[PDB]
Amino acid sequence: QSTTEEQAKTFLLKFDHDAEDLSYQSSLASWNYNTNITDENVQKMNEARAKWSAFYEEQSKAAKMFSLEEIQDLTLKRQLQALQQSGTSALSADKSKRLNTILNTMSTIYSSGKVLDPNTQECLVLEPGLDDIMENSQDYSRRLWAWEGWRAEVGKQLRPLYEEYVVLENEMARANNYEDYGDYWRGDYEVTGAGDYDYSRDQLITDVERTFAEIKPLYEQLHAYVRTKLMDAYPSHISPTGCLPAHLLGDMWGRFWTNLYPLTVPFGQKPSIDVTREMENQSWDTKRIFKEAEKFFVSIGLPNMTQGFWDNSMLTEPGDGRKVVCHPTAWDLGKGDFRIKMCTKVTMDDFLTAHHEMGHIQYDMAYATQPYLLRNGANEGFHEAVGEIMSLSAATPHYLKALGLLPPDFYEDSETEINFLLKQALTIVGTLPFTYMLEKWRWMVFKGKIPKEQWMQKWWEMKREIVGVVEPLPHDETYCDPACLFHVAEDYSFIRYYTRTIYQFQFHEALCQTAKHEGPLYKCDISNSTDAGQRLLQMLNLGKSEPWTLALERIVGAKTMDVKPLLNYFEPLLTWLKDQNGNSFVGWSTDWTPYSE
Ligand SMILES: [Zn+2]
């Protein structure tokens, strides 16, 4: 009968056999570059990546004559659907070539961003001279001049390419039978043929906006409290009900505000939890962290890293003159070979990133038994949310008390707990309204709601009423604020962070419900509960074999976005905050603006 599937299976077997070795020596070569950057190394990475991309493109062509309706299995259909994608080659040669030469332009000059100090004696760049200026500062004029000087230069040259890039991305989107660029990016959450365990492309936009509404009371309370704290910082340019200027947004993008800790501390006489001296008095090294971490994983059934970790992977930067990338990285080389790199140190932040790197790799070991094309997470957010929830339990006071990092008689005060809330909110949660509304801006930009002639001026126009941030000096159409971020030029999605955050909170709530912990969610501990690990394994094993819809239900019990765990987690803060607005106005007053009047 010779069903097409019986030859597509042989084709997929050949593809797996070739691609396993291809990526394995590519990843082996990839490791040799991160740990050793030379002239020879970059060349062979370029050759290997070019060969891999060419082979993938040939296999994408070879997937074309075998249709998708000839496979009834959903899991097998997913592999062909992933492989069938070609890319930008669908249009004519000239448009594709202009795409490649435009992408080259945003690679070279874009990375050479420069600012000019008013005084010539000091010259600073974005890394790290400027970053100190925006983030680590306690004055107004330095931030103002940095904002003006940086934004004055980069917009003019970089604005015109964005519209051409957008229209060309739309043209490739239409080439692949998609309605627009939004539908091109909204296809990552579409499930068809599964049944009731499905998700709609437009349902994500509607549900996220609905979840934003429940955030608004707590967001207003917190923003009012932080504003009342902030009037002591800039009395002469900010009204007690006015918006924060764009040059007092914490940093370049408003994403990281961590360095502003000394100014906005509620209780400055209560010290934060910092036991850094204690492990230095107990001779704890980075290696010892990895085995005490295992003690938590064995409680949930997760084993340790393979033997190749102990010898091949280095726990610190080499000192033989070779310069490396010190960012902690997660590597899945394949073929049972796994290597792990970071310039870790004995610090609490590195203490958490060590468990992230250990635990986020553990996801790879969970689905390592899946086929090579199914050796991935459920989606973009699941993989990056599994790692973060691991360190949540490692930072609990009980875990440190039982691990020797805390005294046996140590008692934590509720005022001490107050710092931990503000810290992790300021790190992860505080940007959730910002991230959601920025992606709303992009979606209406993608949907065409924002007219083409006001693409950048409505970013500032709705900023007055909706974003509640006032600009210090209006700029004309030539300027491009998104050009200040390196990720924009490289086409990096921003909904991944929001999905990761929501999935991480859902995972934490599900694990705590399984752990049968009682009380507010922040006191939850899942250590030593062997029954809680079997439930986790039920979700870890599936990997990419099942959709996120059903994978989320396997651990949580529901197949919908939920912010009730978030409200429960912040319940004490709400109960302590609702009375605060008695003597303060709620929201940001749009009547008073610093720029016009
Ligand atoms: Zn990770």
* CA gap 70, 68 in Å, rounded: 5
455 closest CA partner among 435, 473, 479:
479
Long-range pairs, 409-414, Cβ under 8 A, ≥24? 412/273, 413/270
Write down the residue that tokens 């990761």 correspond to.
500
Task: Give percent helix, percent strand, percent coil of the chain, each to the nearest 5.
Answer: 60, 0, 40
Q: How many helices (H) and strands (E) does the chain have?
A: 23, 2
Record the tokens describing residue 219, joined without a space: 């967001």
Record the tokens describing residue 511, joined without a space: 């694990």
User: Cβ contacts of residue 341 below 8 Å, gap of 6+?
Assistant: 31, 34, 35, 313, 314, 324, 325, 328, 329, 331
* CA gap 332, 586 in Å, rounded: 49
User: Cβ contacts of residue 524 below 8 Å, gap of 6+?
Assistant: 393, 396, 508, 511, 512, 515, 517
Query: Is 470 in a helix, a strand, or coil?
Result: strand
Q: Would you call 124 exposed, middle or buried from its count of C-beta atoms within 10 A (0-12, 13-18, 19+)?
A: middle
Are the C-beta atoms of residues 208 and 436 closer than 8 Å to each other? yes
* CA gap 132, 260 in Å, rounded: 11
* CA gap 440, 209 in Å, rounded: 9
* CA gap 366, 544 in Å, rounded: 11
- Torsion angle, alpha carbons of 506, 511, 565, 543, to 10: 10
Record the tokens describing residue 204, joined without a space: 């994500």
**Cα 96 to Cα 56, 91, 171, 181, distances in angstroms:** 18, 7, 11, 17
Residue 334: phi and psi, rounded to 5, are 90, 175
Buried b / exposed e along 512-539 (16+ C-beta atoms within 10 A): bbbbebeeebbebbbbebeebbebbeeb
**Cα 95 to Cα 53, 115, 161, 164, distances in angstroms:** 20, 34, 14, 11
Record the tokens describing residue 472, joined without a space: 């210090």
Record the tokens describing residue 571, joined without a space: 């319940």
Record the tokens describing residue 5, joined without a space: 């599937």
Q: Would you call 382 exposed, middle or buried from its count of C-beta atoms within 10 A (0-12, 13-18, 19+)?
A: buried
Distance 350 CA to ligand 1 centre (A): 13
**Cα 577 to Cα 416, 420, 434, distances in angstroms:** 17, 16, 21
User: Cβ contacts of residue 367 below 8 Å, gap of 6+?
Assistant: 374, 375, 376, 377, 540, 541, 542, 543, 544, 545
Are the C-beta atoms of residues 197 and 550 closer than 8 Å to each other? yes
Distance 273 CA to ligand 1 centre (A): 24
Distance 382 CA to ligand 1 centre (A): 10
* CA gap 52, 66 in Å, rounded: 22
Sign of CA dihedral 212, 387, 555, 394: negative
Are the C-beta atoms of residues 191 and 549 closer than 8 Å to each other? yes
User: Cβ contacts of residue 202 below 8 Å, gap of 6+?
Assistant: 186
In 10 A of CB 386, how many CB atoms? 24
Distance 150 CA to ligand 1 centre (A): 33
Are the C-beta atoms of residues 469 and 591 closer than 8 Å to each other? no
Query: Is 341 in a helix, a strand, or coil?
Result: strand
357 closest CA partner among 326, 336, 379:
326
Are the C-beta atoms of residues 219 and 430 closer than 8 Å to each other? no
* CA gap 183, 201 in Å, rounded: 8
Distance 366 CA to ligand 1 centre (A): 13
470 closest CA partner among 152, 229, 254, 245:
245
Distance 381 CA to ligand 1 centre (A): 11
Buried b / exposed e along 190-224 (16+ C-beta atoms within 10 A): ebeeeeeebbebeebbeebeebbeebeebebbbbb
Are the C-beta atoms of residues 465 and 590 closer than 8 Å to each other? yes
Sign of CA dihedral 576, 578, 583, 585: positive
Query: Is 221 in a helix, a strand, or coil?
Result: helix
Distance 391 CA to ligand 1 centre (A): 11
* CA gap 143, 453 in Å, rounded: 30
In 10 A of CB 296, how many CB atoms? 20
Record the tokens describing residue 561, joined without a space: 């976005």
Distance 128 CA to ligand 1 centre (A): 26
Start-end of H helices in 379-519: 380-394, 397-403, 414-424, 432-447, 457-462, 486-489, 495-515
Record the tokens describing residue 490, joined without a space: 């490289």
Amino acid (one-letter) located at 152: A
Question: What is 250-283 written as a DSSP string?
Answer: SSSSSS--GGGTTTT-S-TTS-----HHHHHHTT
Record the tokens describing residue 351, joined without a space: 């203490």
Residue 440: phi and psi, rounded to 5, are -60, -45
Question: Using omega within 30 degrees of 0 as the cis cutoff, is the peptide bond preceding 520 cis?
Answer: no
List, in sequence order, every beta strand (DSSP E) within 18-172: none
503 closest CA partner among 569, 548, 440:
548
- Torsion angle, alpha carbons of 414, 415, 419, 422, to 10: 80
* CA gap 38, 29 in Å, rounded: 12
Torsional class of 374: left (φ above 0), alpha (ψ -120 to 50), beta (otherwise): alpha
Question: What is 75-97 written as a DSSP string?
Answer: HHHHHHHHHH---GGGS-HHHHH
User: Crossing angle of helices 203-230/432-447, nearest 10°?
Assistant: 130
Distance 417 CA to ligand 1 centre (A): 26
Write down the residue that tokens 């090294």 correspond to.
285
DSSP assigned state of 374: G
Write down the residue that tokens 């923003």 correspond to.
223
Torsional class of 35: left (φ above 0), alpha (ψ -120 to 50), beta (otherwise): alpha
* CA gap 154, 485 in Å, rounded: 11
Write down the residue that tokens 């990997």 correspond to.
543
**Cα 106 to Cα 98, 171, 295, 456, distances in angstroms:** 12, 20, 47, 19
549 closest CA partner among 558, 539, 559, 541:
559
* CA gap 572, 532 in Å, rounded: 26
The set of catalytic residues is: 357, 487
166 closest CA partner among 461, 482, 486, 485:
482
- What resolution in Å is listed for this PDB structure? 2.6
Q: Greatest CA span in the chain, whole angstroms?
A: 83
Distance 358 CA to ligand 1 centre (A): 8
* CA gap 405, 245 in Å, rounded: 42
* CA gap 291, 286 in Å, rounded: 10
* CA gap 284, 489 in Å, rounded: 43
DSSP assigned state of 304: P
* CA gap 189, 562 in Å, rounded: 17
Ion ligand 1 contact residues with beta carbon within 5 A: 330, 360, 387
Query: Is 244 in a helix, a strand, or coil?
Result: strand
* CA gap 58, 207 in Å, rounded: 39
Technique of determination: cryo-EM
What element of type H or E holds 191?
none
* CA gap 526, 512 in Å, rounded: 7
Distance 420 CA to ligand 1 centre (A): 22
Q: Would you call 64 exposed, middle or buried from its count of C-beta atoms within 10 A (0-12, 13-18, 19+)?
A: exposed
CA atoms within 13 A on the CB side of 455: 19
The number of angstroms, rounded, from the C-alpha of 201 to the middle of its chain's C-alpha atoms is 21
Question: What is 533-596 written as a DSSP string?
Answer: HHHHHHHHHHTTSS-HHHHHHHHTS-SS---HHHHHHTHHHHHHHGGGGGSS--S--SS--TTT
CA atoms within 13 A on the CB side of 565: 22
* CA gap 199, 222 in Å, rounded: 33
Query: Is 334 in a helix, a strand, or coil?
Result: strand
Distance 539 CA to ligand 1 centre (A): 17
- Cα Rg for the chain, rounded, in angstroms? 26
